[PDB]
Subunit: 389 residues, 4 copies
Amino acid sequence: IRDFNNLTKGLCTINSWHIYGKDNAVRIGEDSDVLVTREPYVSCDPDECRFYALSQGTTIRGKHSNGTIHDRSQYRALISWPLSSPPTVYNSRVECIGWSSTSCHDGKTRMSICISGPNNNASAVIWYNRRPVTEINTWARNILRTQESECVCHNGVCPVVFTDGSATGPAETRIYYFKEGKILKWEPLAGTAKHIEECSCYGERAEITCTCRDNWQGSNRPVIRIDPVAMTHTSQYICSPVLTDNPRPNDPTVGKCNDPYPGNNNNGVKGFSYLDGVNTWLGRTISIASRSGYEMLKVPNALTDDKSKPTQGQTIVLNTDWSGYSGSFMDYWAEGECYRACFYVELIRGRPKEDKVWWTSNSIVSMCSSTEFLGQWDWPDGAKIEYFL
Amino acid sequence: IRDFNNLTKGLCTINSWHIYGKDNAVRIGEDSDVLVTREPYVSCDPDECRFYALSQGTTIRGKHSNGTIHDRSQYRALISWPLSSPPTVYNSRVECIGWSSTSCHDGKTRMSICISGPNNNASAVIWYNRRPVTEINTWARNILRTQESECVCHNGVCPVVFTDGSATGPAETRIYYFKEGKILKWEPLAGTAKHIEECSCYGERAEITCTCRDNWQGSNRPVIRIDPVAMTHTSQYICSPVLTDNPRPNDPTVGKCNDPYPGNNNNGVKGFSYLDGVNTWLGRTISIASRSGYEMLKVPNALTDDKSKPTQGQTIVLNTDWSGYSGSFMDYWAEGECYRACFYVELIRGRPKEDKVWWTSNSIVSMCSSTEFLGQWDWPDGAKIEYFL
Amino acid sequence: IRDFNNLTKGLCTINSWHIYGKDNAVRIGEDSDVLVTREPYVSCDPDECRFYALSQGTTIRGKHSNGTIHDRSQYRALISWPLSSPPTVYNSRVECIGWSSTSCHDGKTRMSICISGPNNNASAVIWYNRRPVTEINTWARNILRTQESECVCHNGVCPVVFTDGSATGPAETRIYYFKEGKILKWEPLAGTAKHIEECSCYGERAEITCTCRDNWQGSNRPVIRIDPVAMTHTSQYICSPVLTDNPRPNDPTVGKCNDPYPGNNNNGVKGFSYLDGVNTWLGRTISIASRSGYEMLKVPNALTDDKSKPTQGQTIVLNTDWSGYSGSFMDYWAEGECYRACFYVELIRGRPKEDKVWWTSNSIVSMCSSTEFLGQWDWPDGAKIEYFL
Amino acid sequence: IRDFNNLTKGLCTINSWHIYGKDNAVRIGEDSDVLVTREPYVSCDPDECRFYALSQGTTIRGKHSNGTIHDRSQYRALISWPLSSPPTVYNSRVECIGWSSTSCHDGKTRMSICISGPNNNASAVIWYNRRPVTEINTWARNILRTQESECVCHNGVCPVVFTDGSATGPAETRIYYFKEGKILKWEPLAGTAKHIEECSCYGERAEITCTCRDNWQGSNRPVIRIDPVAMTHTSQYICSPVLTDNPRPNDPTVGKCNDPYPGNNNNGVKGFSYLDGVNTWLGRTISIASRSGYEMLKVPNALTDDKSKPTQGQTIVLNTDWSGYSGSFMDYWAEGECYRACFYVELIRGRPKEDKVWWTSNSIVSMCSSTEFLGQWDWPDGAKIEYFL
Ligand SMILES: *[C@@H]1O[C@H](CO)[C@@H](O[C@@H]2O[C@H](CO)[C@@H](O[C@@H]3O[C@H](CO[C@H]4O[C@H](CO[C@H]5O[C@H](CO)[C@@H](O)[C@H](O)[C@@H]5O)[C@@H](O)[C@H](O[C@H]5O[C@H](CO)[C@@H](O)[C@H](O)[C@@H]5O)[C@@H]4O)[C@@H](O)[C@H](O[C@H]4O[C@H](CO)[C@@H](O)[C@H](O)[C@@H]4O[C@H]4O[C@H](CO)[C@@H](O)[C@H](O)[C@@H]4O[C@H]4O[C@H](CO)[C@@H](O)[C@H](O)[C@@H]4O)[C@@H]3O)[C@H](O)[C@H]2NC(C)=O)[C@H](O)[C@H]1NC(C)=O
Ligand SMILES: *[C@@H]1O[C@H](CO)[C@@H](O[C@@H]2O[C@H](CO)[C@@H](O[C@@H]3O[C@H](CO[C@H]4O[C@H](CO[C@H]5O[C@H](CO)[C@@H](O)[C@H](O)[C@@H]5O)[C@@H](O)[C@H](O[C@H]5O[C@H](CO)[C@@H](O)[C@H](O)[C@@H]5O)[C@@H]4O)[C@@H](O)[C@H](O[C@H]4O[C@H](CO)[C@@H](O)[C@H](O)[C@@H]4O[C@H]4O[C@H](CO)[C@@H](O)[C@H](O)[C@@H]4O[C@H]4O[C@H](CO)[C@@H](O)[C@H](O)[C@@H]4O)[C@@H]3O)[C@H](O)[C@H]2NC(C)=O)[C@H](O)[C@H]1NC(C)=O
Ligand SMILES: *[C@@H]1O[C@H](CO)[C@@H](O[C@@H]2O[C@H](CO)[C@@H](O[C@@H]3O[C@H](CO[C@H]4O[C@H](CO[C@H]5O[C@H](CO)[C@@H](O)[C@H](O)[C@@H]5O)[C@@H](O)[C@H](O[C@H]5O[C@H](CO)[C@@H](O)[C@H](O)[C@@H]5O)[C@@H]4O)[C@@H](O)[C@H](O[C@H]4O[C@H](CO)[C@@H](O)[C@H](O)[C@@H]4O[C@H]4O[C@H](CO)[C@@H](O)[C@H](O)[C@@H]4O[C@H]4O[C@H](CO)[C@@H](O)[C@H](O)[C@@H]4O)[C@@H]3O)[C@H](O)[C@H]2NC(C)=O)[C@H](O)[C@H]1NC(C)=O
Ligand SMILES: *[C@@H]1O[C@H](CO)[C@@H](O[C@@H]2O[C@H](CO)[C@@H](O[C@@H]3O[C@H](CO[C@H]4O[C@H](CO[C@H]5O[C@H](CO)[C@@H](O)[C@H](O)[C@@H]5O)[C@@H](O)[C@H](O[C@H]5O[C@H](CO)[C@@H](O)[C@H](O)[C@@H]5O)[C@@H]4O)[C@@H](O)[C@H](O[C@H]4O[C@H](CO)[C@@H](O)[C@H](O)[C@@H]4O[C@H]4O[C@H](CO)[C@@H](O)[C@H](O)[C@@H]4O[C@H]4O[C@H](CO)[C@@H](O)[C@H](O)[C@@H]4O)[C@@H]3O)[C@H](O)[C@H]2NC(C)=O)[C@H](O)[C@H]1NC(C)=O
Ligand SMILES: OC[C@H]1O[C@@H](O)[C@H](O)[C@@H](O)[C@@H]1O
Ligand SMILES: OC[C@H]1O[C@@H](O)[C@H](O)[C@@H](O)[C@@H]1O
Ligand SMILES: OC[C@H]1O[C@H](O)[C@H](O)[C@@H](O)[C@@H]1O
Ligand SMILES: OC[C@H]1O[C@H](O)[C@H](O)[C@@H](O)[C@@H]1O
Ligand SMILES: OC[C@H]1O[C@H](O)[C@H](O)[C@@H](O)[C@@H]1O
Ligand SMILES: OC[C@H]1O[C@H](O)[C@H](O)[C@@H](O)[C@@H]1O
């Protein structure tokens, strides 16, 4: 009775952002059985949207929260839970086991991907309709890894971006095209992006756009544009001088379209953009040095205009509060003639910036676009670290 | 397969009130993971009735409960949970994010509205079928705010009363008429009510009646009567000398139909009435000074008779116990030829009246009408504050 | 699509009892959020059987557990929860509010009844399909009260036995016949039973048999047999000298069919029997003085034979362990040509017998009949009281 | 609308194993309400796979966890819970009561079997569609007991292996053939296996293969092959010199097909194999002395070749970590032309090996086969015992 979803609509006009979800997980977890997480995201099914993240297999107050600054262990899993509830022991659904993930619904059912293993011997398991269907072994033997936010599907084809290799030099990025959890095709990265991590993707009018993290040399963000019908892609960087990785140098007046904008090496943060002509909005941390603050900037033609500057903006998280990863999603099953852009921001608490506790976790805030020009508030995690001492 | 509900029935004859629900949330939350709340209510779908409230994004025993006397923060959300269970971390569904709300089912699906933001820049998000559909920016830049109990729908049209502006002088009240979460029309307040807050509404025979709080000058309650087909309304005050706001002066022998009954300024409490000729019942606190006690009084023709006094009553909460906000709802999908009036009372515990704890929360008690003349009990919150010290 | 259930089958031959359910609630609640309860029972829907009990509106470890020896408060409610799970804050469904209850499914949906109020002004609320439908005021102004185990329905007619009046003298017992939560008829108690409390009922071949507690004078149990088609009944006592109330005198060699067997006044315990000719089994405590131990005895023709003695038995709970109330239920929707008799035993822990704790609660054990002659085990609550100190 | 499942497919080619599930129960239970368990397994329905285990009727942190090294009590039950979640008080479903179990879905609904009682008087209760249908009394009066992992069905016939009698000498093993919870037939053990415990079974091409534990004399594993259409079986031992019980002597160069391989008496561990010609994989502990480590070895023709040695392998749990019972299951309702072999390993923590705590419990790890040659990781329980002190 269900058909595959097709990306038949364009983006709605984004004139501001409204609050969509917030879980207050760290506040609540100070005195309830909330799992330690990081790398969260949001993804919709045709009848529900849910929060997702990588659990660390312990509660925050639990003694096993000590050491959760670490990224890869056998105790991590992709979990999902109801929108704006916290990720608790009792309400979280485990989608698959591992320390890197993506997930998306194709209109009929959901594909989830988790990678696990030691650094030199990791493998992806691709689940479809809550069953494992395909496995992929590491090709470069160096932390096979993927998006950490939702993938996007079109007529059953769900492309996913993976990287295997160094985070501080050339690596081997591949785009896999899945259908019903099976590999139709894969391609090596093409175009002018020089390094790819942690792609944040969205779809509109039969094209999928991903904004990624050049961890090696670039403080501008690489962009991959995927045609899920032809199963081909292109890549470049956001041309705009409004630089959106972190850490980063100060904004110049002219950016770079086909190479990394230099100044900071071997670091970054997962982030996102919506690239739609004049209707283009970029997210970034406010700090150029650290994962603090978060703002959206309207930067008309950021993708293609190497001198484009902001014409409007919205503060999401004050620079006096911690942010983190951010990513895109949309409710492809909503009513109306256009898709409304959404995003989330991971609000990281604990280590390394707050080292009086022994753990690292996060909460989530999420916003979607409005055609109104709405007033802005800031949305901090809200927990008091001293309470955990 | 579902059609919009129509208000085709009149009210059942109210001869007494029977216990409908009670969650004992503060008792239970002394040793379980119960969220701090305030501004609760009850609302029915065609196949379930649920408790609703504004969470404070912390448990009661949690250290973040300190400071929850405050009304507006980024950590509040409209939550719902099963009838007479407590609002726990693990059983509460987040409907939307914000610090002021309303919600109602139209027979097909549910509309929920949450307002958030700083005082001078708040916005409403109107959700329908669990998706955001419309947003409304503040028009007076002073705590845009709404009912804090359920709205009512008729043939898909669900009117909602909002206020923006001062709580201690003239403000800008609007009635919005929504259908499928979209704005059909709005109107500014008309009639003789001089200030409107926190409307408590019910529907019968194609009319919606709301009893509100005149926070500015009136200790009688303003009333708005809305025709959801014509999308028009009128307003006045309850004429009766049985005054039902709090705090209030002592009852006179003659009330006021078209102006605030004076004596107390710049305060009030959310409350409700059922105004149905001889079948008219008013709720109020027992104390004229504080939110303590709660009683129902049968006051025939209270709406229109400026000398009407009680002919029957029922004590709901003794004056030696704390009460709080109260509001109306009905199960529009019940069997029978008439709609049975129901209400809830918020039983506030903690600050400011019980200041040995650092938190403010509440539990809920709820009653519905009977055509029998039933014996009465009183229904306290039941928690011992000393246990929380 | 569902029709009312009819009692078309006879009882299966009972040759022994097998374990059906057990919740270990007190053990588990020593370190999890388990509600304090008493007066439990079991009742089936067409697609699920559940545990039921009167909550006390606090967890066991909670400070509000102090005082829960008391029977009637505003903090009690009928709750249900999944078979053999414990009654927790997070998995318990509130069916109605009050301190006395019954509940049964008619094949289409469930009727639940809760009574609340002060001793001289109590009222029953009859819920059907999870909505209140009928209310009944106290008729004798002295703790209106009902079965504390499931009722039984036949072609939509669900009789329920109520008592109002003294527990230590003549009282006013009524049988109400409900359909879809509405009163079709009621009758005063007739026959030779002189006092009725806490009836435990089952149905077979279009008749409902209830075994009750004569709290006033009788240590034999009164029996009410109800024809739910004619809506009439009879009553007498179990004739057998195998006395089954508690406390009680020692067993004589000849019982009494039409009067209380004397020796103990003004006390008792809820209990049950299956009265089916040679296929007759009685439950009782092992102790004649206290609620300790529990055994089933096959006593052919106990109902009608005033010299009938046991021919077989099964120990359920050793006399060195606490028991409590017990009652009957069956899964009227099971497969097969006959109905299998089941029962539960309430295993009371805490006050008054274990007074080093300040609370009273219980767990549940439940058995059903087998046509095999199965080996027996004993089934204690299993908690160590010292752990709660 | 559902038909009985038939075993129409063969096994997929097993070239390695991928992570399927892991619950981290002991880590998480250090600070959440996780039930103490042992003897876990996994079993699929047509629309969900779940974890199963025998609860001990207490949480790990609870004071009643003291003494849970013991195997048989009245506080045990078969529980199930969602895949890779932990077995918590609030998310666990009780399937039946007892201290030995099996369970399987026949394509229409699920059969579950639990045994309880004292050692000399135990009985099995066979539940079907969540109702008790058949009971079986002990035949040898010495701990009637069964598989502790899933059974397998074919056209409605679900064979189950039981043992009653000594664990240290000849015993009375029976194969029962159930359909809709009713006994069609049973047979005594035939063939050359000399003692049978704790069979781990799987089905393919209309045959069911079970690998068991010879607790008496054998360090090779007995195998029972059952034809569920003819309702007949055969038995022998795995011929291979790759010995897979524990404890065990060192591997010889030639095994035994029709007798126990000697060297260790009166002990063992539940384990499993997939016996499919060249596509044969055996699981075993790494240690020959204790339940530590776990590895899979590809041993072509292990069943029939008494000199067969490994040609490939995969380490699942390092020898420096505790393992435990292991068993087979498959998702018979997955897509594709073949059934993918899966297994679980019980990771036992606490007593007797870690005796600074007073409890014994476990977590679960589970893997399924891949046709890829995937890299390997090890999968420890992950809890730090010192945290529980
Ligand atoms: C209630 O809520 C509402 C709604 O949210 C609030 O209103 C919002 O207020 C915020 C804050 O002011 C606004 O965001 C800022 O928007 C401006 C862009 O708008 C300005 O510029 C526009 C473009 O002008 C240029 O081009 C036009 C033609 O296209 C031309 O006409 C003009 O002459 C000029 O050449 C103007 O069009 C626009 O005017 C319009 O709107 C006005 C209202 O804002 C109105 O008054 C006008 O009439 C007209 O209608 C307006 O002038 C962004 O520039 C700004 O972002 C910069 O600054 C913030 C800090 O404030 C910074 O964090 C951003 O990153 C960014 O600045 C950095 O990057 C730049 C780009 O590289 C760089 O140049 C800067 O130096 C700076 O760089 C440094 O910091 C970064 C980050 O740390 C670092 O990486 C660098 O290295 C470096 O160190 C904000 O986004 C909203 O747009 C506004 N919304 C609406 C709908 O009005 C309202 O205030 C609330 N009310 C109350 C009472 O609180
Ligand atoms: C078992 O349960 C049952 C059921 O619940 C219990 O029975 C209930 O008992 C309660 C408590 O007594 C009753 O509530 C009160 O009801 C009266 C109204 O009924 C009286 O008056 C009626 C009207 O009489 C006038 O008009 C009629 C014609 O219409 C005329 O005939 C008559 O002469 C007179 O002119 C009478 O009809 C009625 O009689 C009927 O019922 C009697 C039983 O009650 C029965 O005996 C008769 O035969 C007949 O059938 C009866 O006399 C309310 O007036 C009263 O409310 C006032 O008082 C309470 C405190 O008790 C107060 O809190 C209320 O706010 C209110 O008083 C305040 O406001 C007034 C209005 O402005 C003001 O005038 C007062 O001075 C007072 O004001 C002060 O306090 C307020 C609040 O703090 C403050 O704001 C002000 O500023 C100021 O300081 C109660 O609601 C139930 O009706 C009754 N139910 C039933 C079905 O019987 C039963 O008791 C329980 N059993 C046991 C053993 O416990
Ligand atoms: C493995 O599990 C199995 C299955 O559970 C275990 O087997 C079960 O074992 C138990 C315990 O022994 C049995 O329960 C008892 O059953 C007897 C009834 O059976 C006896 O009597 C039958 C009737 O005999 C009379 O009539 C027949 C004709 O109808 C006639 O032939 C005969 O001559 C005589 O006239 C016999 O038919 C029956 O024999 C059959 O079964 C035998 C096996 O049991 C077998 O050996 C035979 O071959 C034959 O097949 C048998 O002799 C009940 O009487 C007994 O209940 C009384 O005693 C218990 C305490 O043990 C007490 O708590 C009960 O309340 C009751 O006694 C009180 O009440 C009486 C009635 O008023 C009174 O007379 C007593 O004085 C006593 O009263 C005192 O205490 C009470 C309570 O505290 C107090 O209120 C009073 O005031 C007073 O102070 C038991 O129910 C099971 O039936 C049996 N099941 C099966 C299937 O075999 C097996 O043991 C386990 N294995 C192991 C190794 O553990
Ligand atoms: C990334 O991940 C990948 C994938 O997991 C990792 O690659 C895996 O690496 C592991 C570990 O090395 C491998 O497992 C071992 O496999 C060998 C079997 O393969 C060897 O032997 C094969 C058979 O050879 C014989 O026959 C062939 C013809 O059939 C003939 O040609 C040959 O001459 C010989 O006669 C070879 O075919 C095979 O070669 C192939 O693969 C090689 C890669 O492995 C490749 O290099 C070749 O080119 C070729 O393609 C290979 O040589 C198992 O033997 C071994 O299991 C034994 O040893 C482990 C300990 O390491 C032990 O725990 C096992 O129990 C077992 O040894 C015990 O039992 C034996 C049987 O009775 C006994 O003989 C031993 O003495 C020993 O007994 C003692 O211990 C036990 C247990 O404690 C005790 O009970 C006894 O009493 C006694 O005390 C392993 O299973 C994987 O197969 C391999 N997978 C793949 C796909 O490559 C990779 O390493 C990872 N990368 C990194 C960087 O980490
Ligand atoms: O009816 C008057 C009062 O009587 C008391 O016994 C009840 O407990 C109160 O709740 C009631 O208000
Ligand atoms: O492959 C051999 C070993 O390599 C290690 O790096 C992995 O962590 C182990 O799990 C593995 O068994
Ligand atoms: O060594 C790092 C590991 O320490 C503990 O196991 C932590 O619980 C785990 O999250 C972390 O990966
Ligand atoms: O400053 C007031 C705030 O303090 C803390 O954050 C409380 O948890 C929050 O409820 C409150 O709004
Ligand atoms: O006074 C007796 C009452 O004390 C406390 O409220 C107990 O929590 C309650 O159960 C009991 O009814
Ligand atoms: O005596 C052993 C028993 O002790 C306690 O009851 C434990 O909680 C239980 O698991 C165990 O069987």
